Design an enzyme around this catalytic site. Structure first.
Site, mmCIF file in Angstrom:
data_model
loop_
_atom_site.group_PDB
_atom_site.id
_atom_site.type_symbol
_atom_site.label_atom_id
_atom_site.label_comp_id
_atom_site.label_asym_id
_atom_site.label_seq_id
_atom_site.Cartn_x
_atom_site.Cartn_y
_atom_site.Cartn_z
ATOM 1 N N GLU A 12 0.859 -1.286 -0.007
ATOM 2 C CA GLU A 12 0.220 -0.035 0.097
ATOM 3 C C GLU A 12 0.749 1.347 -0.058
ATOM 4 O OE1 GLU A 12 -2.868 -0.297 3.235
ATOM 5 O OE2 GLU A 12 -4.115 1.441 2.198
ATOM 6 N N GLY A 19 -8.766 5.370 5.998
ATOM 7 C CA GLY A 19 -9.618 5.171 7.201
ATOM 8 C C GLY A 19 -9.169 4.221 8.211
ATOM 9 N N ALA A 20 -8.399 3.163 7.869
ATOM 10 C CA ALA A 20 -7.976 2.282 8.977
ATOM 11 C C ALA A 20 -6.580 2.160 9.269
ATOM 12 C CB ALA A 20 -8.770 0.852 8.483
ATOM 13 N N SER A 21 -5.646 2.614 8.168
ATOM 14 C CA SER A 21 -4.120 2.797 8.405
ATOM 15 C C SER A 21 -3.746 3.757 7.913
ATOM 16 C CB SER A 21 -3.333 1.407 7.854
ATOM 17 O OG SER A 21 -3.580 1.334 6.561
ATOM 18 N N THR A 22 -2.447 4.320 8.179
ATOM 19 C CA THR A 22 -1.626 5.275 7.488
ATOM 20 C C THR A 22 -0.239 4.863 7.245
ATOM 21 O OG1 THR A 22 -1.466 7.775 7.731
ATOM 22 C CG2 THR A 22 -0.862 6.366 9.670
ATOM 23 N N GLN A 23 0.031 5.266 6.031
ATOM 24 C CA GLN A 23 1.362 4.882 5.477
ATOM 25 C C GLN A 23 2.512 6.143 5.130
ATOM 26 O OE1 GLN A 23 -1.442 3.434 3.642
ATOM 27 N NE2 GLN A 23 -1.249 2.195 5.573
HETATM 28 N N1 LIG Z 1 -14.331 15.492 2.368
HETATM 29 C C1 LIG Z 1 -13.794 14.639 3.465
HETATM 30 N N2 LIG Z 1 -13.417 15.264 4.314
HETATM 31 C C2 LIG Z 1 -12.812 14.565 5.539
HETATM 32 N N3 LIG Z 1 -12.595 13.174 5.514
HETATM 33 C C3 LIG Z 1 -13.085 12.474 4.353
HETATM 34 C C4 LIG Z 1 -13.775 13.381 3.188
HETATM 35 N N4 LIG Z 1 -14.018 12.361 2.323
HETATM 36 C C5 LIG Z 1 -13.403 11.204 2.527
HETATM 37 N N5 LIG Z 1 -12.967 11.359 3.819
HETATM 38 C C6 LIG Z 1 -12.462 10.295 4.810
HETATM 39 O O1 LIG Z 1 -11.250 9.816 4.580
HETATM 40 C C7 LIG Z 1 -11.390 8.589 4.830
HETATM 41 C C8 LIG Z 1 -10.920 7.673 3.634
HETATM 42 O O2 LIG Z 1 -10.499 6.100 4.140
HETATM 43 P P1 LIG Z 1 -10.575 5.045 3.248
HETATM 44 O O3 LIG Z 1 -11.890 4.570 2.952
HETATM 45 O O4 LIG Z 1 -9.846 3.686 3.911
HETATM 46 O O5 LIG Z 1 -9.789 5.312 1.746
HETATM 47 C C9 LIG Z 1 -12.346 7.949 5.302
HETATM 48 O O6 LIG Z 1 -12.303 8.222 6.901
HETATM 49 C C10 LIG Z 1 -13.549 9.044 4.975
HETATM 50 O O7 LIG Z 1 -14.557 9.270 5.727
#
Ligand SMILES: Nc1ncnc2c1ncn2[C@@H]1O[C@H](COP(=O)(O)O)[C@@H](O)[C@H]1O
Length: 419
Positions: A130, A169-173
């Site tokens: 990732e 949403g669940a990890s950071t790289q």
């Molecule tokens: N416009 C936004 N402002 C703040 N967070 C967002 C926005 N759009 C998406 N996200 C968040 O970004 C993260 C994307 O996580 P993922 O689905 O693992 O890519 C999730 O926590 C989403 O709720």
């Protein structure tokens, strides 16, 4: 100029996105040549959200797959590879239930096999995958893998590469080119791209994605305060405790409790700071949680929720974030807003609004306390989500690797002229 197409489904923790890429047939091994043709956002949750109803995981993809039929010319469907890659949402589900995980993967596979594209599989990416594929995407798109100069006068040092920081949403790289000695094989990456060797560091912090950090802070606030210092004064909600503690990320931390915000920037800062363990480091230097990390260096692009959060601070709050001190100040101001004051700045839909304070605080601490950026290194960080009309994420680098579109060496080693 015949074009070829490729499709990646990014099965992220909170959502699935589909990207369709296109490139000229006869120029396909050129760096930067592939670009995004179209995209589609799948309605609803991530595929891991269907752990107890796996059939729905496959069905969720249909509307975007129907779009792909329209987006790619018909005569090209059959020779267009289709990949699905899933990330930390599925990595967590796999901790909970390898069986449910396999059933979700089976369900998306069954759906994807019904379509006329050359389906090449549904896989869970490693954290390393990732991080590295995101770094590849950014650098490929920005043409950093070009050998700049000409015979007898090559630029020295070699053109720098862009480090990558991805907040899902669940990890950071965090991934970047480094000259530091490797101390942990799990973080060490060596790439051979267009005749050049890149020594890269990468790490993925599972449970440090945006949604999981918000869940952990909620759990912590419940335990320590019975109010949420990161939520704005006047905001409250009915918290279902089952949801708070069901995640592998919060298991370590009365069906329903009311919880209210207090707009306490300082207590919020203190709550966030508990996410980073700096007590111990078995290496010469660590980021946090005893993870080896060399000093950050070079430019960086910070995308995904880094971008969304900073964009909120700059465009909605109207605050500068050019320095770590400005980012800190903007976080304090945001966190100190009451719920009425915050709502007044946002005329439209209010989803995620109560969470910006906590996420901004997290990002500030992650960068400064976690990764050890300072004002000098932070000046080299840009927040962007797109390059050359293409979304920045791991999907492009993933497609490039699986379709073998980046050669290890130039044709004929370019007659040895880069030796
Ligand atoms: N416009 C936004 N402002 C703040 N967070 C967002 C926005 N759009 C998406 N996200 C968040 O970004 C993260 C994307 O996580 P993922 O689905 O693992 O890519 C999730 O926590 C989403 O709720």
């Amino acid at each position: 100029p015949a074009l070829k197409y490729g499709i990646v489904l990014d099965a992220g923790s909170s959502h699935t996105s589909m990207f369709v890429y296109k490139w000229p047939a006869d120029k396909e091994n050129d760096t930067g040549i592939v670009g995004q043709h179209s995209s589609c956002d799948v309605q609803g949750g991530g595929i891991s959200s269907y752990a107890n109803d796996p059939s729905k995981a496959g069905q969720s993809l249909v509307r975007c797959l129907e779009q792909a039929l329209r987006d790619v010319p018909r005569d090209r469907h059959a020779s267009t590879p289709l990949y699905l890659g899933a990330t930390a949402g599925m990595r967590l589900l796999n901790l909970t239930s390898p069986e449910a995980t396999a059933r979700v993967l089976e369900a998306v596979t069954q759906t994807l096999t019904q379509y006329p594209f050359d389906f090449r599989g549904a896989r869970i990416l490693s954290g390393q995958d990732e991080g590295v594929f995101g770094w590849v995407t950014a650098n490929y798109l920005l043409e950093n893998f070009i050998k700049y100069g000409w015979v007898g006068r090559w630029i020295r040092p070699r053109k720098g590469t862009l480090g990558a920081m991805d907040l899902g949403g669940a990890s950071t790289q965090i991934t970047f080119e480094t000259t530091s000695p490797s101390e942990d094989p799990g973080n060490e990456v060596h790439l051979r791209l267009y005749g050049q060797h890149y020594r890269v560091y990468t790490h993925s912090f599972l449970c440090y994605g945006r949604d999981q950090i918000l869940l952990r802070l909620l759990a912590s606030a419940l335990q320590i305060h019975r109010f949420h210092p990161c939520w704005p004064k006047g905001y409250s909600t009915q918290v279902l405790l089952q949801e708070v503690y069901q995640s592998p990320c919060t298991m370590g931390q009365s069906a329903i409790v009311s919880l209210s915000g207090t707009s306490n920037a300082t207590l919020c800062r203190d709550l966030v700071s508990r996410l980073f363990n700096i007590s111990s480091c078995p290496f010469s230097q660590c980021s946090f949680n005893g993870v080896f990390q060399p000093p950050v260096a070079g430019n960086f692009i910070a995308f995904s929720a880094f971008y969304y959060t900073v964009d909120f601070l700059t465009t909605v709050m109207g605050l500068p974030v050019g320095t770590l001190k400005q980012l800190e100040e903007a976080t304090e101001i945001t966190c100190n807003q009451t719920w009425t004051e915050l709502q007044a700045r946002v005329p439209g839909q209010k989803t995620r609004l109560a969470d910006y304070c906590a996420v901004a605080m997290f990002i500030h601490q992650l960068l400064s306390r976690g990764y050890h950026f300072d004002e000098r290194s932070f000046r080299e960080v840009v927040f962007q989500k797109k390059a050359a009309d293409t979304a920045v994420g791991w999907a492009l680098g993933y497609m490039l690797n699986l379709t073998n579109l980046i050669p290890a060496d130039l044709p004929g080693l370019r007659k040895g002229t880069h030796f």
